From Swiss-Prot:
Phylogenetic classification of the source organism: Viruses, Riboviria, Orthornavirae, Kitrinoviricota, Flasuviricetes
Record text on activity regulation: Activity is up-regulated by PRK2/PKN2-mediated phosphorylation.
Superkingdom of origin: Viruses
RdRp catalytic domain ranges (all copies): 214-332
Description of how the protein assembles with itself and partners: Homooligomer. Interacts with non-structural protein 5A. Interacts with host VAPB. Interacts with host PRK2/PKN2. Interacts with host HNRNPA1 and SEPT6; these interactions facilitate viral replication. Part of the replication complex composed of NS2, NS3, NS4A, NS4B, NS5A and the RNA-directed RNA polymerase.
Protein name (database record): RNA-directed RNA polymerase
Residues of the full protein shown: 2443 to 2990 of 3033
Cofactor binding annotation: Binds 2 magnesium ion that constitute a dinuclear catalytic metal center.
Catalytic activity annotation: RNA(n) + a ribonucleoside 5'-triphosphate = RNA(n+1) + diphosphate
Length: 548
């Protein structure tokens, strides 16, 4: 019923937090310097807590029961195995929060005796005790954004709840294989985390075109993790148990569910008792899978209850998109309210009220949207994009405060064909790499389910294999996309696109001077910056393949 209960103890930081940069070397232009970027910190943790703390009223119906039955049948078609202790240790990222038991990721990844022995006792404890709640640590996330004076004030920090390192390894042993198969088995094409950008585009276009008169909407649940009830979480376990799993995993899964996922005591960085959770914990292995499947179920039952006609959905955690047959604007608005009302009954209230959309380009799925531009031959070419405000804000921050994993490399790769990646991010970072003389240096970034290491000097081949040769020749972007990029640059206080184009020439010229891979980067990545474009022929792209 109540998402959380608090003792009064504060949510404390573990290190001194920085909220603003001393200098922003991206939003600077000879005579115009700005710094509108910020990082969330502990100071806003109490605000967040108040936002996410409320009573959940949940009431199901025949629509829900029916859909859940279908999903459990689908789940019985899956088989999963226990992960080996070694396999689980090997899946532990390099710098994940150390344990309070005398070891860190380093020791787990190398299987040191202390870590291994501890994990074995934890796992054993899961098999014996299925009741005792596992303590969790709660902390405020430090994420970078750009002030948006019109939409509102600075965002409050997100809260992150997670168990000790030893428990996190045991989660993988029991549910990792499941997290890799279950969502697709029960959702099929609707499971969003299975598509590369080109496929996501193909999916959205295909969904929009199959309707005689399309209408779509992206649902946004207000504090989704906070809306999922204990009932929802136990139901998720029955869905897992529907699978074909070894008795030992079933035991651990039930324990993990009753002692962790369902809820439990939270402590701050100081060890003080902070409160009690009765909703989704943000830092557990099953959060992405649990949210996705629970959102799909509620969403599918909602569509039926509301009478949504021929719905095709795409789910990405708590982000949901529905494309169906339009019934006329009047009827579509009535159907959406009905949908929203049902979602609310299922305890999945909306943040921003949903509204019908009749232009595919304006529908945001998994944070992105489809747009179009012209290829070298002049034909239409579709690609995935998104609002660049946050992505660039973080690129600026990561320019000054160098982090272990870079978000900018990831955005460049995932959004290579976008005009904001080509004219801003690429021009900026290649200029910064040559300034520091670190072009061939490998960097780490994230696409989820991993951290990848790559050299900027290999970007052109990576981009061709991922998006094709057209990624270097798109032109004539839509007025909606150009406007959005321009708005983003204004809010950031960065120079306009035409200025980046001036700079791109010098970057391109410098790269070509260095010859080698750098020269390729210059000719391919900046062919847009010159009037007399070069040829551009296939590269040794046919020598790689990605997982994410």
């Amino acid at each position: 019923s109540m998402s959380y209960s608090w003792t009064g103890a504060l949510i404390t930081p573990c290190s001194p937090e920085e909220e603003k940069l001393p200098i922003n070397p991206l939003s600077n232009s000879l005579l115009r310097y700005h710094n509108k970027v910020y990082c969330t910190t502990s100071k806003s943790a109490s605000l967040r807590a108040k936002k996410v703390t409320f009573d959940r009223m949940q009431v199901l119906d025949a629509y829900y029961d029916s859909v859940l039955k279908d999903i459990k049948l689908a789940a019985s078609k899956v088989s999963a195995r226990l992960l080996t202790l070694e396999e689980a240790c090997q899946l532990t990222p390099p710098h994940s929060a150390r344990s309070k038991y005398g070891f860190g990721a380093k020791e787990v990844r190398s299987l040191s005796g202390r870590a291994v022995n501890h994990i074995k006792s934890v796992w054993k404890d899961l098999l014996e005790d299925s009741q005792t709640p596992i303590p969790t640590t709660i902390m405020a996330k430090n994420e970078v954004f750009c002030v948006d004076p019109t939409k509102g004030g600075k965002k409050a920090a997100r809260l992150i709840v997670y168990p000790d390192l030893g428990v996190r390894v045991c989660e993988k042993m029991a549910l990792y294989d499941v997290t890799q198969k279950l969502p697709q088995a029960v959702m099929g094409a609707s499971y969003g985390f299975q598509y590369s950008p080109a496929q996501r585009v193909e999916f959205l276009l295909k969904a929009w075109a199959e309707k005689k008169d399309p209408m779509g909407f992206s649902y946004d649940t207000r504090c989704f993790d906070s809306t999922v009830t204990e009932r929802d979480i136990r139901t998720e376990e029955s869905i897992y148990q529907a699978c074909s799993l070894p008795e030992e995993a079933r035991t651990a899964i039930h324990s993990l569910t009753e002692r962790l996922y369902v809820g439990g005591p939270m402590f701050n960085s100081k060890g003080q008792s902070c409160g009690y959770r009765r909703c989704r914990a943000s830092g557990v292995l099953t959060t992405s899978m649990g949210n996705t499947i629970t959102c799909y179920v509620k969403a599918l039952a909602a569509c039926k209850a509301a009478g949504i006609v021929a719905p095709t959905m795409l789910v990405c955690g708590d982000d949901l998109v529905v494309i169906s047959e339009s019934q006329g604007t009047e009827e579509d608005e009535r159907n959406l309210r009905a949908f929203t009302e049902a979602m609310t009954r299922y305890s999945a209230p909306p943040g921003d009220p949903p509204r019908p959309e009749y232009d595919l380009e304006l529908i945001t799925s998994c944070s992105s949207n489809v747009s179009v531009a012209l290829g070298p031959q002049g034909r239409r070419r579709y690609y995935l994009t998104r609002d660049p405000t946050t992505p660039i804000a973080r690129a600026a921050w990561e320019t000054v405060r160098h982090s272990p994993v870079n978000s900018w490399l990831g955005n460049i790769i995932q959004y290579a064909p976008t005009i904001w990646v080509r004219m801003v991010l690429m021009t900026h970072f290649f200029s910064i790499l040559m300034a520091q003389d670190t072009l061939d240096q490998n960097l780490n970034f994230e696409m989820y389910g991993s951290v990848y290491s790559v050299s900027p000097l290999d970007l052109p081949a990576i981009i061709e294999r991922l998006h094709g040769l057209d990624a270097f020749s798109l032109h004539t972007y839509t007025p909606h996309e150009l406007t959005r990029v321009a708005s983003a640059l204004r809010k950031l206080g960065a120079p306009p696109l035409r200025a980046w184009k001036s700079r791109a020439r010098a970057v391109r010229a410098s790269l070509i001077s260095r010859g080698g891979r750098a020269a390729v980067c210059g000719r391919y990545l900046f062919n847009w910056a010159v009037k007399t474009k070069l040829k551009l022929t296939p590269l040794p792209e046919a020598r790689l393949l990605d997982l994410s």
